[PDB]
Design an enzyme around this catalytic site. Structure first.
Site, PDB file in Angstrom:
ATOM      1  N   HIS A   1       6.744 -20.343  18.948  1.00  0.00           N
ATOM      2  CA  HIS A   1       7.684 -19.813  17.967  1.00  0.00           C
ATOM      3  C   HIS A   1       7.883 -20.801  16.824  1.00  0.00           C
ATOM      4  O   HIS A   1       8.900 -21.503  16.782  1.00  0.00           O
ATOM      5  CB  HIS A   1       9.024 -19.500  18.626  1.00  0.00           C
ATOM      6  CG  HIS A   1       9.050 -18.192  19.349  1.00  0.00           C
ATOM      7  ND1 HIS A   1       9.233 -16.991  18.700  1.00  0.00           N
ATOM      8  CD2 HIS A   1       8.920 -17.894  20.661  1.00  0.00           C
ATOM      9  CE1 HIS A   1       9.223 -16.011  19.584  1.00  0.00           C
ATOM     10  NE2 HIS A   1       9.036 -16.532  20.781  1.00  0.00           N
TER      11      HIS A   1
ATOM     12  N   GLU B   1       8.714 -20.435  13.769  1.00  0.00           N
ATOM     13  CA  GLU B   1       9.831 -20.153  12.871  1.00  0.00           C
ATOM     14  C   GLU B   1      11.066 -20.982  13.199  1.00  0.00           C
ATOM     15  O   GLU B   1      11.940 -21.137  12.341  1.00  0.00           O
ATOM     16  CB  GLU B   1      10.159 -18.655  12.883  1.00  0.00           C
ATOM     17  CG  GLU B   1      10.806 -18.130  14.152  1.00  0.00           C
ATOM     18  CD  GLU B   1       9.782 -17.746  15.203  1.00  0.00           C
ATOM     19  OE1 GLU B   1       8.638 -18.234  15.124  1.00  0.00           O
ATOM     20  OE2 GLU B   1      10.124 -16.973  16.122  1.00  0.00           O
TER      21      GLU B   1
ATOM     22  N   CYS C   1       3.660 -15.436  19.258  1.00  0.00           N
ATOM     23  CA  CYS C   1       3.657 -15.225  20.705  1.00  0.00           C
ATOM     24  C   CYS C   1       3.053 -13.900  21.181  1.00  0.00           C
ATOM     25  O   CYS C   1       1.833 -13.788  21.381  1.00  0.00           O
ATOM     26  CB  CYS C   1       5.092 -15.359  21.225  1.00  0.00           C
ATOM     27  SG  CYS C   1       5.213 -15.495  23.014  1.00  0.00           S
TER      28      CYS C   1
END
Ligand SMILES: O=c1ccn([C@@H]2O[C@H](COP(=O)(O)OP(=O)(O)OP(=O)(O)O)[C@@H](O)[C@H]2O)c(=O)[nH]1
Ligand SMILES: O=c1ccn([C@@H]2O[C@H](COP(=O)(O)OP(=O)(O)OP(=O)(O)O)[C@@H](O)[C@H]2O)c(=O)[nH]1
Ligand SMILES: O=c1ccn([C@@H]2O[C@H](COP(=O)(O)OP(=O)(O)OP(=O)(O)O)[C@@H](O)[C@H]2O)c(=O)[nH]1
Ligand SMILES: c1ccc(-c2csc(Nc3nc4cc5c(cc4s3)OCO5)n2)nc1
Ligand SMILES: c1ccc(-c2csc(Nc3nc4cc5c(cc4s3)OCO5)n2)nc1
Ligand SMILES: c1ccc(-c2csc(Nc3nc4cc5c(cc4s3)OCO5)n2)nc1
Ligand SMILES: NC(=O)CC[C@H](N)C(=O)O
Ligand SMILES: NC(=O)CC[C@H](N)C(=O)O
Ligand SMILES: NC(=O)CC[C@H](N)C(=O)O
Ligand SMILES: [Mg+2]
Ligand SMILES: [Mg+2]
Ligand SMILES: [Mg+2]
Lengths: 535, 535, 535
Positions: free
Chosen positions: B507, B509, B389
């Site tokens: 994002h 993750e 990001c």
């Protein structure tokens, strides 16, 4: 210079309904008579943001302030004993506190913290308490703030306010903070003994949250023996000068005398080291003469929900008695159901022995046809009538039907009525004080003895200006209005049609005090007395 | 037919941080491997309506769901152990409950009642618990709901949720409800003894609110002796089969094996009378081989707030390790401060020994110039870089400055910049899953091995479409976009400029699991391994 | 075969004096009438090893068992409702438990342990409870043991017994253990409402120590409304079938009928799964006829400490009423002070309107001259007199003074008397049952209709055998003695001297029951009736 402002916290044990709000009011009356400046606050632990949603027949009337706050009715006991206009700030609720902290949190004002009950909720409550001690708009700082904590010690909902009061004691110290605890002493008839154990467990519960009471008020049906007060003082670790016996008094206006006989106010004044002075009783002695030695009795019908006393009309009942006090008359309230008056024979049965009919207002009612029947009967008999808010609306509807608009109704109760003589100008609820002008030498102008008045409002429907000319064919006068004349505020019949038939859109019972009767209740009870005399 | 759905409540004593959320996750992994269908819920007692206001460096990362809920990070442990997309309904807070009940009250839905903590708040919590047991959109009903209650037993803020869990036990009975209690056993070095007294007082506190635990998990730095477990079982009135010893394990992925060695899941299955089956370990055995027997080590710089582990990057650290597991490599995280990289010499000191640089995102950061310095240094050295990001935004800003727009910046960090190459398309925060299309044979398309992807979002600034042509003079490719091309989603350098320098606005993750590494983390750790090999 | 023995625990809230011992007695009467075998136990939380030290005018009479235990007076309600001789094991105190555990500790029996409240005190209490369930000397095992726990839930002294009762529930399970909780519902006259909040807080206190009540007994001056019972059931988590309304009854013998009307015993029998049967009322219906429809009234003076009812003479007052029930007569007790009878004119004032005089015994009195005045007056008037223990001693002293031994006295009240006609044979306190033989056709032999009797004793002085020949110059007969004649047990005047003037050294009121009046009280109330008839 003036001392630091003292904080006195009033709390209750064993049960609710023990009268700790009348205790706080009587202590305020006593401390005011010794020349101190007192201000008062109530904390309500319920989650309703205000009682305007709550049913008044279950939970009592909503009190309305000058600034248009809907508050708990205890604020009305504060007003009647202090004779002071209290702000909306005088009532705090859990719903207000949580809504405020959650709004601050959603705006980011807590700078990325975890928001908690302690500190942030207790900080908001403590801020609202300490705010009462700030100078008013005229620069006066109170000598004491009396804060009544609602609920019972042991309630889950009470715990944040008691923790904030403990934090105030820690912050200001024991020289500036006093704790008064109200408790029940029950009598057991089979064994014939008063039991101290409930008070002991209540004080133990209070001690378990870090508060020690400075005095105990023992509520009982009979005077507590000296040996029992000694046992209580010993077990509860309370000064024997601070264990006060308060049997139930004949009226709420005796409670100041009872508390002074026990010297509770002298104990408080000594403990807080306030500037002592004697009480002057002269005006409250005149009140208690008018209370206890009336010259005559008159019966007022109250056409309410049910044939029994309800806190839904606490301030109307008190205003009727206060209006009687001016004449030295006992006003006995005949609680009459609206529905027994729906038939004309039923009206003539229920409203038969009475000398005046009061038509009270409020929310929490559905259907009005019985009240219109009561008004029609009373006008036929020639009784005096006072209609409060909805009572005005019923008087206007009864007039409209009397001029032949048989289906005329309030749009609130018949949305399909072809002639909505009462309608919204859901509309806007008018709240709080609004000015009015009165037609000169109108009946209301004679009552107020002025052409200009202000009254508190709580309504959202108005008299339909399209129907004024037709309603006036009855001879009804729109004798009081908003200053532009756009809104009807008062209606009257001319004196030669009926001696006194008046409605007002306002709630004047909220401006009444026992030491200062409201002009309309004086004039209404006067017309009732004159009817009893003429009949 | 399927049985009634069981409710298992996980609760904690003595302290927080004891790992009861990893306990609940490991019990869910075990019960899933025995063939039961498990769903999971967390209750957070804080008053924040969501953690999106809370500082992530104090309170840890905000997890983001597919439906775009901002949730507590424990929902990410649930996702990683279940490998399930959890709803926003998986996290409840006190702020949500109070805001909901107060909104219902202001709408009149409680029909004129006094609104209270009991029943109305506990009813709302109990409704939110029992709602988890309803069939999903595909008609599947869970066999168990595991509900973790946040805080510590004894906290004022915990009390409503524990009272609701007690009411669920009363409503469904002990055959359908299990209570698991996590507690600390401390070791005192001067006297050399483990102390059971804190667990005894914690279980006594739990019993004082009407809950008896079915099992105790004892958290300790060493294995609790059998005699101490016997003393605990005796004093706490707990079945000795239910006193479980759980010393701290080398990794969080060992906790399932530890809990199975102690037979906690077999105790639970017997007690709830669930359909028993053996666990199949084969896949978690392969995971634990990749955890404990890596073939090589590689160092990844994380250019965060501070040179120490923070839960602000819990899921990024886990995603990096999972991306390493694919290669059988140990990924050692070198936590590097952003500010040590602000000077080029400082960057060459801090980012000197590492093989890849990760630029993590999030809110709670101010100033980005050090991260741009880290990116510039890494591109000069030829390191691989993954920017998440804000890492994409820094890569685009570093490119803009490299093409001579020396003052080019994000408008979030220089509102007066003459060249706002990052700007709001306060703008609108994009939340949750959005689709993207990838340029064919782009580096990202090779990583995903597809041209169409979806990723979770939490941002409100976008790449300025007015600057694309100038930024592209660096050779940067806007290789991934929204499906219309209007929004940049991925940027890459062509492989002959740098081996792997990628940013994504998403994002990723949050989509990673230890059993299913995310494609970009696989490709990034692959480029880091290739750099270590070539250097 | 017989089931496992059930344990029913009776506990009290808000206050003492709520009548939970009469509740336990009435439940025992009901369960006995359904054919179950009931045995009963009381737990007293005070530290006195027995009440033999306690003042009976403050704390009530000491009950005496056949085996010569001094017990709490509730054991007498158990005896009167069961009509069973209860052992000394039926009363436990904290003083007994601590003295026992400390004695075991000083003998080394705990094998070098630290001795604690839990386990060792609670183990001793639990052993004393479970011992009640063992077979009696005739091999009968009870179906239920009813155990009444003294004090109030919330008292520091109550906590060990409540913890032991909880441990019994855990050991035997909810199928074998029932908890009955007695609580107060107060009425507030100013607001006209019954308050449920004290019961809610009491049940919350009980729940905080790990006990949930199976039923609530609500003690009130008026019948609790159905809506209030519903609110209580809802808030307290109690089955609505188990919320029992028990207004105060006209007599203690109505309580079984009240509890049966509410179906408490049927609720208990169902809950414990005991062998159900209907109650047979025929004998208790005959009792209640003799209670509520007496044919005549007679007045008995009781020459006690004070002119008001005292539990110091609870069993004497009950024995007098039971003796009246045989004749279908109402015996109205005229409580007369000993000291008003000290002057002969004062005696003629206080004992003037009565038809019989009872001279009660006991410890806790000092000085007897007023009772001797009462006896002298009554013999002069020709009233019937019954003297119990000390009443015999006063009759013998009054006789001695009448034969001219003007200074003759009890050595207990004049140690310097020259003629100690009552003296120790500090002497030895005789306790419990001792046999006696009665002279054939003596007045007492006619009352018992036998020459051989046994009676319970609690005294340490005897009639001086050296003075028998002189006392007999009055015509007094030593008509009952110990079997060797060594001890005087009964004295009488021959019928032609007085119609009935009898003393006994025993306490026969302890053998009396409402269903089985004692022979002497029958013969005494008969002589009182005959005097009223002849006068
Ligand atoms: O003066 C106040 C103000 C507010 N409240 C709040 O109203 C709610 C109800 O408190 P209650 O005292 O009325 O409990 P209850 O009605 O159920 O029990 P009884 O009448 O039979 O005695 C509680 O949350 C309390 O904190 C009061 O009790 N008293
Ligand atoms: O210094 C003292 C003196 C006396 N005692 C008394 O000894 C008794 C046992 O108190 P403990 O503290 O030893 O409890 P425990 O042994 O069962 O728990 P752990 O060791 O595992 O921590 C308790 O009754 C206490 O009051 C102490 O604990 N400490
Ligand atoms: O039935 C019993 C037996 C024994 N006790 C024990 O007697 C002691 C005194 O317990 P109390 O209930 O009598 O307290 P109190 O006298 O001081 O308060 P009130 O009368 O005014 O209500 C306490 O230790 C209690 O446990 C009872 O209260 N009731
Ligand atoms: C609603 C409810 C009741 C009444 C009402 C009418 S008369 C009366 N008698 C009372 N005496 C005392 C005495 C106290 C006290 C409170 C009271 S209330 O606290 C300090 O000592 N209550 N009115 C409307
Ligand atoms: C943040 C914080 C810590 C860790 C971390 C790394 S390794 C490790 N060891 C652990 N062993 C157990 C064993 C348990 C248990 C919890 C844990 S946590 O509850 C059941 O028994 N914790 N990671 C990020
Ligand atoms: C000493 C003290 C009092 C009395 C006495 C005389 S009459 C009477 N009335 C009663 N009614 C109930 C009703 C109950 C109950 C207990 C009682 S006591 O528990 C279950 O419901 N008590 N006698 C000596
Ligand atoms: N306060 C009242 O009496 C309200 C009356 C009527 N419901 C109105 O709103 O106009
Ligand atoms: N999640 C993030 O990294 C946010 C980055 C940046 N503040 C934005 O909103 O675009
Ligand atoms: N129980 C009693 O009346 C005792 C009487 C006298 N004090 C005695 O011991 O003989
Ligand atoms: Mg007492
Ligand atoms: Mg120890
Ligand atoms: Mg109530």
């Amino acid at each position: 210079p003036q001392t630091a402002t003292k904080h006195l916290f009033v709390s209750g044990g064993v049960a609710s309904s023990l009268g700790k709000g009348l205790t706080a009011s009587s202590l305020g009356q006593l401390l005011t008579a010794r020349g101190l400046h007192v201000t008062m606050q109530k904390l309500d632990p319920y989650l309703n943001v205000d009682p305007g949603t709550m049913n008044p027949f279950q939970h009592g009337e909503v009190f309305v302030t000058e600034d248009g706050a809907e508050t708990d009715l205890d604020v009305g006991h504060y007003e009647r004993f202090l004779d002071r206009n209290l702000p909306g700030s005088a009532n705090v609720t859990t719903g207000q506190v949580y809504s405020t902290v959650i709004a601050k949190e959603r705006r980011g004002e807590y700078l990325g913290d975890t928001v908690q009950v302690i500190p942030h909720i207790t900080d908001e409550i403590k801020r609202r308490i300490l705010a009462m001690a700030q100078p008013d708009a005229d620069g006066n700082r109170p000598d004491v703030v009396i804060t009544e904590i609602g609920g019972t010690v042991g309630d889950i909902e009470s715990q944040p306010f008691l923790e904030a009061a403990r934090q105030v004691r820690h912050y200001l110290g024991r020289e500036d903070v006093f704790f008064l605890h109200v408790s029940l002493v029950p009598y057991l008839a089979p064994s014939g003994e008063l039991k101290t154990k409930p008070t002991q467990h209540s004080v133990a519960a209070l001690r378990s949250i870090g508060i020690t009471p400075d005095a105990l008020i023992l509520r009982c049906d009979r005077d507590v023996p000296e040996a029992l007060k000694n046992k209580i003082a010993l077990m509860c670790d309370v000064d024997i000068d601070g264990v006060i016996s308060t049997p139930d008094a004949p009226s709420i206006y005796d409670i100041p005398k009872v508390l002074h006989r026990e010297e509770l106010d002298a104990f408080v004044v000594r403990r807080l080291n306030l500037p002592f002075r004697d009480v002057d009783w002269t005006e409250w002695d005149d009140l208690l003469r008018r209370v206890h030695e009336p010259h005559e009795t008159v019966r007022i019908a109250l056409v309410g929900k049910y044939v029994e006393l309800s806190d839904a009309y606490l301030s109307v009942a008190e205003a009727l008695r206060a209006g009687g006090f001016k004449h030295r008359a006992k006003v006995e309230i005949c609680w009459v159901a609206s529905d027994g008056c729906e038939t004309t024979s039923g009206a003539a049965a229920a409203l038969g022995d009475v000398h005046g009919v009061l038509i009270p207002g409020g929310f929490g009612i559905r259907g009005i046809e019985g009240k219109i029947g009561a008004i029609a009967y009373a006008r036929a008999r020639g009784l005096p009538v006072l209609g409060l808010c909805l009572g005005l609306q019923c008087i206007v509807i009864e007039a409209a039907r009397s001029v032949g608009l048989t289906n005329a109704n309030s749009a609130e109760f018949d949305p399909d009525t072809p002639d909505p003589v009462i309608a919204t100008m859901g509309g806007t609820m008018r709240l709080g004080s609004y000015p009015a002008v009165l037609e000169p030498d109108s009946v209301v102008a004679q009552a107020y003895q002025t052409t200009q008045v202000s009254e508190r409002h709580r309504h959202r429907y108005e008299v339909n200006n399209a129907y004024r000319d037709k309603i006036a064919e009855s001879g009804l006068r729109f004798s009081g209005t908003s200053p532009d004349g756009h809104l009807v505020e008062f209606v009257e019949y001319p004196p030669d049609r009926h001696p006194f038939v008046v409605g007002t859109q306002a709630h004047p019972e909220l401006k009444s005090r026992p030491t200062r009767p409201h002009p309309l209740f004086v004039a209404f009870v006067g017309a009732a007395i004159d009817y009893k005399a003429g009949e």
